[PDB]
Amino acid sequence: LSQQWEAGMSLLMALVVLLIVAGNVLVIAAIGSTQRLQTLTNLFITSLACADLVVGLLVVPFGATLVVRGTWLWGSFLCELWTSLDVLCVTASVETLCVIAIDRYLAITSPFRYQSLMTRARAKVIICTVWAISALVSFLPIMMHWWRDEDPQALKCYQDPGCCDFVTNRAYAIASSIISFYIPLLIMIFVALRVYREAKEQIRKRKTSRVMLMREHKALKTLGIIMGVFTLCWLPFFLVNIVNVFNRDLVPKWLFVAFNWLGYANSAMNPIILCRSPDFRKAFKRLLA
Ligand SMILES: CCCCCCCC/C=C\CCCCCCCC(=O)OC[C@H](O)CO
Ligand SMILES: CCCCCCCC/C=C\CCCCCCCC(=O)OC[C@H](O)CO
Ligand SMILES: CC(C)(C)NC[C@H](O)COc1cccc2c1CC(C#N)=N2
Ligand SMILES: NC(=O)CN(CC(=O)O)CC(=O)O
Ligand code: NA
Ligand code: NA
Numbered sequence: 001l002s003q004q005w006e007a008g009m010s011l012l013m014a015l016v017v018l019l020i021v022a023g024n025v026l027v028i029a030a031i032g033s034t035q036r037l038q039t040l041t042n043l044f045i046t047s048l049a050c051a052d053l054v055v056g057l058l059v060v061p062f063g064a065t066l067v068v069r070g071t072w073l074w075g076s077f078l079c080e081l082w083t084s085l086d087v088l089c090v091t092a093s094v095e096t097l098c099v100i101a102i103d104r105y106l107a108i109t110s111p112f113r114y115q116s117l118m119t120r121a122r123a124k125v126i127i128c129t130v131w132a133i134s135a136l137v138s139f140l141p142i143m144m145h146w147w148r149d150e151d152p153q154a155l156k157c158y159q160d161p162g163c164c165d166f167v168t169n170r171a172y173a174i175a176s177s178i179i180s181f182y183i184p185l186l187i188m189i190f191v192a193l194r195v196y197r198e199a200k201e202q203i204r205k206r207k208t209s210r211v212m213l214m215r216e217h218k219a220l221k222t223l224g225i226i227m228g229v230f231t232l233c234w235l236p237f238f239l240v241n242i243v244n245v246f247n248r249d250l251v252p253k254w255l256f257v258a259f260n261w262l263g264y265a266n267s268a269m270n271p272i273i274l275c276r277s278p279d280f281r282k283a284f285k286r287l288l289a
Contacts, residue, residue: 006068013064016268020056023271024049030274030283037279041223043123044103045274047096047130048226051089052267059086060264067257072164079164084142090234090263091180092134097227098188099126104220105195108202137179147172165253173245181238185231192227195220222277226270233266 027049031037062082065073072079107114141147148158149169157163168176199220203213237259244251274280 009064009068013060013068016264017056017060017064020052020060020267023268024052024056026284026287027271027274027280028053029287030280033287034279034283037283038120039219040118040120040123041100041104041219043120044096044100044127047127048093048270051093051096052270054085054089055264055267058082059089060267063264066164071162073162074164076161079161080142082164083166084139087142087176087180088134088138091138092131093230093266094181094184094188094234095130095134096127097230098184098191099130100223101188101191101195101227104223105191105198108195108198111206134180137176141172141176147176168245170245173241177238177241181234185235188227189231192224196224219277219279222273225273229269229273230266233269234263237263 028046031042031046059082062074062078063086074082103118147166147168148154149167151167154167157165157167199217203210203217206213208216240251240256240259244256275284
Protein backbone atom coordinates (compact mmCIF):
# COMPACT_ATOMS: atom_id res chain seq x y z
CA LEU A 1 0.00 0.00 0.00
CA SER A 2 3.00 2.32 0.50
CA GLN A 3 4.08 0.98 -2.92
CA GLN A 4 0.80 2.07 -4.56
CA TRP A 5 1.26 5.55 -3.06
CA GLU A 6 4.92 5.52 -4.23
CA ALA A 7 3.73 4.48 -7.73
CA GLY A 8 0.64 6.68 -7.56
CA MET A 9 2.73 9.75 -6.80
CA SER A 10 5.57 8.84 -9.20
CA LEU A 11 3.24 8.89 -12.21
CA LEU A 12 1.54 12.12 -11.11
CA MET A 13 5.03 13.81 -10.62
CA ALA A 14 6.18 12.68 -14.08
CA LEU A 15 3.10 14.38 -15.62
CA VAL A 16 3.72 17.59 -13.65
CA VAL A 17 7.32 17.64 -14.98
CA LEU A 18 6.07 16.97 -18.56
CA LEU A 19 3.50 19.75 -18.41
CA ILE A 20 5.91 22.31 -16.92
CA VAL A 21 8.78 21.41 -19.25
CA ALA A 22 6.76 21.05 -22.48
CA GLY A 23 4.62 24.12 -21.82
CA ASN A 24 7.58 26.39 -21.22
CA VAL A 25 9.57 25.01 -24.12
CA LEU A 26 6.43 25.70 -26.25
CA VAL A 27 6.25 29.36 -25.06
CA ILE A 28 9.92 29.89 -25.87
CA ALA A 29 9.53 28.19 -29.29
CA ALA A 30 6.43 30.36 -30.05
CA ILE A 31 8.27 33.54 -29.33
CA GLY A 32 11.38 32.39 -31.25
CA SER A 33 9.51 31.29 -34.41
CA THR A 34 6.91 34.09 -34.83
CA GLN A 35 7.46 37.63 -36.04
CA ARG A 36 4.33 38.92 -34.25
CA LEU A 37 5.76 37.72 -30.81
CA GLN A 38 9.12 39.49 -31.24
CA THR A 39 8.14 42.25 -28.79
CA LEU A 40 10.19 43.49 -25.84
CA THR A 41 7.68 42.26 -23.24
CA ASN A 42 7.98 38.74 -24.67
CA LEU A 43 11.70 38.87 -24.18
CA PHE A 44 10.84 39.41 -20.50
CA ILE A 45 8.35 36.57 -20.70
CA THR A 46 11.27 34.42 -21.91
CA SER A 47 12.98 35.05 -18.51
CA LEU A 48 9.93 33.69 -16.72
CA ALA A 49 9.65 30.69 -18.89
CA CYS A 50 13.35 29.99 -18.17
CA ALA A 51 12.86 30.14 -14.40
CA ASP A 52 9.88 27.81 -14.89
CA LEU A 53 12.01 25.49 -16.99
CA VAL A 54 14.65 25.22 -14.25
CA VAL A 55 11.81 24.41 -11.90
CA GLY A 56 10.52 21.60 -14.17
CA LEU A 57 14.00 20.06 -14.88
CA LEU A 58 15.94 20.43 -11.65
CA VAL A 59 13.75 21.45 -8.71
CA VAL A 60 10.63 19.30 -9.16
CA PRO A 61 12.45 16.00 -9.90
CA PHE A 62 14.60 16.19 -6.74
CA GLY A 63 11.58 17.37 -4.79
CA ALA A 64 9.31 14.52 -5.98
CA THR A 65 11.90 11.99 -4.71
CA LEU A 66 11.81 13.66 -1.30
CA VAL A 67 8.00 13.63 -1.39
CA VAL A 68 7.52 9.94 -2.34
CA ARG A 69 10.49 8.34 -0.50
CA GLY A 70 10.18 10.70 2.52
CA THR A 71 14.00 11.15 2.82
CA TRP A 72 16.71 13.00 0.80
CA LEU A 73 18.70 10.61 -1.44
CA TRP A 74 21.24 12.89 -3.08
CA GLY A 75 23.65 13.88 -0.27
CA SER A 76 24.44 17.11 1.51
CA PHE A 77 25.95 19.12 -1.39
CA LEU A 78 23.09 18.52 -3.82
CA CYS A 79 20.70 19.35 -0.95
CA GLU A 80 22.29 22.82 -0.80
CA LEU A 81 22.53 23.29 -4.54
CA TRP A 82 18.86 22.24 -4.96
CA THR A 83 17.76 24.70 -2.28
CA SER A 84 19.80 27.52 -3.84
CA LEU A 85 18.30 26.95 -7.33
CA ASP A 86 14.79 26.70 -5.86
CA VAL A 87 15.30 30.03 -4.07
CA LEU A 88 16.92 31.56 -7.24
CA CYS A 89 13.99 30.60 -9.58
CA VAL A 90 11.38 32.18 -7.29
CA THR A 91 13.50 35.34 -6.90
CA ALA A 92 14.23 35.79 -10.63
CA SER A 93 10.49 35.18 -11.42
CA VAL A 94 9.17 37.94 -9.06
CA GLU A 95 11.97 40.41 -10.12
CA THR A 96 11.14 39.79 -13.85
CA LEU A 97 7.42 40.38 -13.15
CA CYS A 98 8.24 43.65 -11.31
CA VAL A 99 10.41 44.72 -14.32
CA ILE A 100 7.54 43.89 -16.73
CA ALA A 101 5.19 46.09 -14.67
CA ILE A 102 7.61 49.08 -14.68
CA ASP A 103 8.48 48.66 -18.33
CA ARG A 104 4.81 48.73 -19.37
CA TYR A 105 4.09 51.69 -17.10
CA LEU A 106 6.84 53.66 -18.93
CA ALA A 107 5.72 52.35 -22.32
CA ILE A 108 2.09 53.61 -21.88
CA THR A 109 2.99 56.97 -20.22
CA SER A 110 5.80 57.84 -22.63
CA PRO A 111 5.38 55.83 -25.86
CA PHE A 112 7.64 58.12 -27.92
CA ARG A 113 10.57 58.25 -25.53
CA TYR A 114 10.23 54.53 -24.78
CA GLN A 115 10.23 53.35 -28.38
CA SER A 116 13.17 55.63 -29.26
CA LEU A 117 15.34 54.36 -26.36
CA MET A 118 14.54 50.65 -25.64
CA THR A 119 16.04 47.82 -27.72
CA ARG A 120 15.97 44.03 -27.92
CA ALA A 121 19.57 44.08 -26.63
CA ARG A 122 18.86 46.53 -23.76
CA ALA A 123 16.08 44.21 -22.60
CA LYS A 124 18.54 41.21 -22.72
CA VAL A 125 20.78 43.28 -20.43
CA ILE A 126 18.08 44.07 -17.91
CA ILE A 127 17.32 40.31 -17.85
CA CYS A 128 20.97 39.51 -17.23
CA THR A 129 21.07 42.01 -14.33
CA VAL A 130 17.92 40.45 -12.81
CA TRP A 131 19.49 36.98 -12.80
CA ALA A 132 22.78 38.35 -11.43
CA ILE A 133 20.91 40.16 -8.58
CA SER A 134 18.75 37.10 -7.97
CA ALA A 135 21.82 34.77 -7.83
CA LEU A 136 23.61 37.15 -5.43
CA VAL A 137 20.69 37.38 -2.94
CA SER A 138 20.00 33.64 -3.33
CA PHE A 139 23.33 31.84 -3.58
CA LEU A 140 25.50 33.91 -1.27
CA PRO A 141 23.49 33.57 1.97
CA ILE A 142 23.13 29.80 1.42
CA MET A 143 26.87 29.43 0.68
CA MET A 144 27.83 31.40 3.80
CA HIS A 145 25.50 29.39 6.04
CA TRP A 146 23.77 32.58 7.21
CA TRP A 147 20.56 30.56 7.23
CA ARG A 148 21.55 27.95 9.85
CA ASP A 149 19.53 27.61 13.10
CA GLU A 150 20.99 26.42 16.43
CA ASP A 151 18.10 24.24 17.78
CA PRO A 152 18.98 20.49 18.25
CA GLN A 153 16.28 19.57 15.73
CA ALA A 154 17.99 21.90 13.21
CA LEU A 155 21.47 20.61 14.11
CA LYS A 156 20.30 16.98 13.73
CA CYS A 157 18.94 17.83 10.22
CA TYR A 158 22.27 19.45 9.23
CA GLN A 159 24.33 16.43 10.39
CA ASP A 160 21.97 14.02 8.56
CA PRO A 161 22.66 13.90 4.75
CA GLY A 162 19.18 12.27 4.47
CA CYS A 163 17.47 15.37 5.86
CA CYS A 164 17.01 18.32 3.44
CA ASP A 165 14.34 20.43 5.36
CA PHE A 166 15.19 24.14 4.90
CA VAL A 167 15.18 24.76 8.70
CA THR A 168 16.35 28.40 9.10
CA ASN A 169 16.85 31.01 11.89
CA ARG A 170 14.36 33.86 12.14
CA ALA A 171 16.65 36.56 10.97
CA TYR A 172 17.42 34.85 7.68
CA ALA A 173 13.76 33.86 7.16
CA ILE A 174 12.46 37.39 7.45
CA ALA A 175 15.27 39.14 5.62
CA SER A 176 15.51 36.70 2.72
CA SER A 177 11.70 36.76 2.35
CA ILE A 178 11.59 40.60 2.31
CA ILE A 179 14.36 40.91 -0.24
CA SER A 180 13.61 37.96 -2.53
CA PHE A 181 9.77 38.20 -2.56
CA TYR A 182 7.81 40.75 -0.49
CA ILE A 183 9.42 44.00 -1.83
CA PRO A 184 9.40 43.15 -5.54
CA LEU A 185 5.82 41.72 -5.13
CA LEU A 186 4.57 44.91 -3.44
CA ILE A 187 6.20 47.03 -6.16
CA MET A 188 4.84 44.80 -8.97
CA ILE A 189 1.33 45.08 -7.56
CA PHE A 190 1.44 48.88 -6.94
CA VAL A 191 2.79 49.62 -10.41
CA ALA A 192 0.50 47.09 -12.16
CA LEU A 193 -2.54 48.75 -10.62
CA ARG A 194 -1.37 52.11 -11.97
CA VAL A 195 -0.87 50.55 -15.45
CA TYR A 196 -4.39 49.26 -15.21
CA ARG A 197 -5.66 52.75 -14.23
CA GLU A 198 -3.83 54.53 -17.07
CA ALA A 199 -4.88 51.98 -19.78
CA LYS A 200 -8.49 52.44 -18.68
CA GLU A 201 -8.16 56.25 -18.90
CA GLN A 202 -6.66 55.98 -22.41
CA ILE A 203 -9.38 53.83 -24.06
CA ARG A 204 -12.04 56.08 -22.53
CA LYS A 205 -10.48 59.19 -24.02
CA ARG A 206 -3.08 59.02 -27.72
CA LYS A 207 -3.43 59.70 -31.46
CA THR A 208 -3.79 55.89 -31.87
CA SER A 209 -7.19 54.52 -32.94
CA ARG A 210 -9.46 53.06 -30.20
CA VAL A 211 -9.35 49.59 -31.88
CA MET A 212 -5.55 49.71 -31.80
CA LEU A 213 -5.68 50.58 -28.07
CA MET A 214 -8.09 47.78 -27.37
CA ARG A 215 -5.55 45.39 -28.97
CA GLU A 216 -2.75 46.87 -26.80
CA HIS A 217 -5.03 46.35 -23.81
CA LYS A 218 -5.61 42.66 -24.53
CA ALA A 219 -1.84 42.01 -24.36
CA LEU A 220 -1.61 44.02 -21.07
CA LYS A 221 -4.45 41.84 -19.72
CA THR A 222 -2.39 38.69 -20.30
CA LEU A 223 0.44 40.08 -18.19
CA GLY A 224 -1.94 41.12 -15.43
CA ILE A 225 -3.39 37.58 -15.25
CA ILE A 226 0.14 36.09 -14.94
CA MET A 227 0.85 38.53 -12.16
CA GLY A 228 -2.35 37.79 -10.21
CA VAL A 229 -1.86 34.03 -10.54
CA PHE A 230 1.76 34.30 -9.41
CA THR A 231 0.55 36.19 -6.34
CA LEU A 232 -2.14 33.58 -5.50
CA CYS A 233 0.33 30.72 -5.99
CA TRP A 234 3.22 32.11 -3.86
CA LEU A 235 1.82 34.42 -1.18
CA PRO A 236 0.42 31.59 0.96
CA PHE A 237 3.86 29.88 1.13
CA PHE A 238 5.57 33.17 2.06
CA LEU A 239 2.97 33.99 4.74
CA VAL A 240 3.32 30.48 6.17
CA ASN A 241 7.12 30.61 6.01
CA ILE A 242 7.03 33.49 8.49
CA VAL A 243 4.33 32.05 10.83
CA ASN A 244 6.41 28.85 10.96
CA VAL A 245 9.78 30.39 11.96
CA PHE A 246 7.94 31.97 14.88
CA ASN A 247 6.06 28.83 15.91
CA ARG A 248 6.90 25.52 14.31
CA ASP A 249 3.69 23.94 15.70
CA LEU A 250 1.44 26.38 13.81
CA VAL A 251 2.33 24.78 10.41
CA PRO A 252 2.69 21.01 10.22
CA LYS A 253 5.26 19.76 7.74
CA TRP A 254 2.85 18.19 5.23
CA LEU A 255 0.89 21.45 5.08
CA PHE A 256 4.07 23.51 4.59
CA VAL A 257 4.90 21.11 1.78
CA ALA A 258 1.46 21.50 0.24
CA PHE A 259 1.84 25.29 0.22
CA ASN A 260 5.29 25.00 -1.41
CA TRP A 261 3.72 22.79 -4.17
CA LEU A 262 1.06 25.35 -4.87
CA GLY A 263 4.07 27.64 -5.69
CA TYR A 264 5.73 25.04 -7.94
CA ALA A 265 2.35 24.66 -9.73
CA ASN A 266 2.73 28.25 -10.92
CA SER A 267 5.36 27.04 -13.37
CA ALA A 268 2.65 24.87 -15.13
CA MET A 269 0.24 27.80 -15.28
CA ASN A 270 1.88 30.38 -17.51
CA PRO A 271 1.96 28.40 -20.76
CA ILE A 272 -1.70 27.52 -20.24
CA ILE A 273 -2.57 31.22 -19.62
CA LEU A 274 -0.53 32.18 -22.73
CA CYS A 275 -2.60 29.65 -24.76
CA ARG A 276 -5.55 32.06 -24.51
CA SER A 277 -3.71 35.13 -25.88
CA PRO A 278 -4.54 35.20 -29.65
CA ASP A 279 -0.97 35.55 -31.06
CA PHE A 280 0.37 32.75 -28.81
CA ARG A 281 -2.55 30.42 -29.52
CA LYS A 282 -2.03 30.65 -33.33
CA ALA A 283 1.65 29.89 -32.87
CA PHE A 284 0.96 26.89 -30.60
CA LYS A 285 -1.53 25.52 -33.21
CA ARG A 286 1.07 25.70 -35.97
CA LEU A 287 3.88 24.19 -33.75
CA LEU A 288 1.88 21.13 -32.60
CA ALA A 289 0.77 19.72 -36.04
C1 LIG B 1 4.61 60.77 -8.38
C2 LIG B 1 5.29 60.30 -7.10
C3 LIG B 1 4.78 58.93 -6.66
C4 LIG B 1 5.88 58.05 -6.09
C5 LIG B 1 5.36 56.66 -5.75
C6 LIG B 1 6.35 55.57 -6.15
C7 LIG B 1 6.94 54.80 -4.96
C8 LIG B 1 7.73 53.56 -5.39
C9 LIG B 1 7.13 52.94 -6.64
C10 LIG B 1 7.86 52.18 -7.48
C11 LIG B 1 9.32 51.91 -7.22
C12 LIG B 1 10.14 51.92 -8.52
C13 LIG B 1 11.50 51.25 -8.27
C14 LIG B 1 12.36 51.17 -9.53
C15 LIG B 1 13.15 49.86 -9.60
C16 LIG B 1 13.05 49.20 -10.98
C17 LIG B 1 14.41 49.11 -11.68
C18 LIG B 1 14.33 48.62 -13.11
O1 LIG B 1 15.27 47.99 -13.59
O2 LIG B 1 13.19 48.87 -13.97
C19 LIG B 1 13.00 48.09 -15.15
C20 LIG B 1 13.21 48.93 -16.41
O3 LIG B 1 12.60 50.21 -16.26
C21 LIG B 1 12.60 48.27 -17.65
O4 LIG B 1 12.65 49.21 -18.74
C1 LIG C 1 -5.86 38.73 -6.01
C2 LIG C 1 -4.64 38.97 -6.90
C3 LIG C 1 -3.99 40.33 -6.62
C4 LIG C 1 -2.66 40.54 -7.35
C5 LIG C 1 -2.89 41.24 -8.69
C6 LIG C 1 -1.60 41.56 -9.41
C7 LIG C 1 -1.75 42.69 -10.42
C8 LIG C 1 -2.88 42.45 -11.44
C9 LIG C 1 -3.56 43.75 -11.79
C10 LIG C 1 -4.74 43.81 -12.43
C11 LIG C 1 -5.55 42.61 -12.89
C12 LIG C 1 -5.27 42.30 -14.36
C13 LIG C 1 -6.51 41.94 -15.17
C14 LIG C 1 -7.33 43.18 -15.54
C15 LIG C 1 -8.56 42.73 -16.32
C16 LIG C 1 -9.42 43.86 -16.88
C17 LIG C 1 -10.07 43.38 -18.18
C18 LIG C 1 -11.52 43.73 -18.27
O1 LIG C 1 -11.88 44.81 -18.73
O2 LIG C 1 -12.50 42.75 -17.83
C19 LIG C 1 -13.11 41.81 -18.71
C20 LIG C 1 -13.10 42.33 -20.15
O3 LIG C 1 -14.01 43.45 -20.21
C21 LIG C 1 -13.52 41.25 -21.14
O4 LIG C 1 -12.98 41.54 -22.44
C1 LIG D 1 12.08 23.11 -0.46
C2 LIG D 1 12.24 24.65 -0.26
C3 LIG D 1 11.77 24.98 1.19
C4 LIG D 1 13.75 24.96 -0.30
N1 LIG D 1 11.42 25.45 -1.27
C5 LIG D 1 11.79 26.87 -1.32
C6 LIG D 1 10.66 27.67 -1.89
O1 LIG D 1 10.18 27.13 -3.16
C7 LIG D 1 11.25 29.06 -2.14
O2 LIG D 1 11.38 29.67 -0.93
C8 LIG D 1 12.09 30.86 -0.89
C9 LIG D 1 12.31 31.66 -1.98
C10 LIG D 1 13.03 32.85 -1.88
C11 LIG D 1 13.49 33.22 -0.60
C12 LIG D 1 13.26 32.42 0.46
C13 LIG D 1 12.57 31.25 0.31
C14 LIG D 1 12.47 30.70 1.52
C15 LIG D 1 13.13 31.51 2.39
C16 LIG D 1 13.29 31.24 3.84
N2 LIG D 1 13.47 31.03 5.10
N3 LIG D 1 13.64 32.52 1.73
N1 LIG E 1 28.41 8.96 0.73
C1 LIG E 1 28.41 10.12 0.05
O1 LIG E 1 28.79 10.17 -1.12
C2 LIG E 1 27.92 11.42 0.76
N2 LIG E 1 27.46 11.24 2.17
C3 LIG E 1 27.81 12.40 3.05
C4 LIG E 1 27.10 13.73 2.68
O2 LIG E 1 26.37 13.77 1.67
O3 LIG E 1 27.30 14.68 3.45
C5 LIG E 1 26.05 10.90 2.18
C6 LIG E 1 25.81 9.90 3.35
O4 LIG E 1 26.71 9.69 4.20
O5 LIG E 1 24.68 9.40 3.41
NA1 NA F 1 8.50 31.09 -12.03
NA1 NA G 1 20.97 17.40 6.10
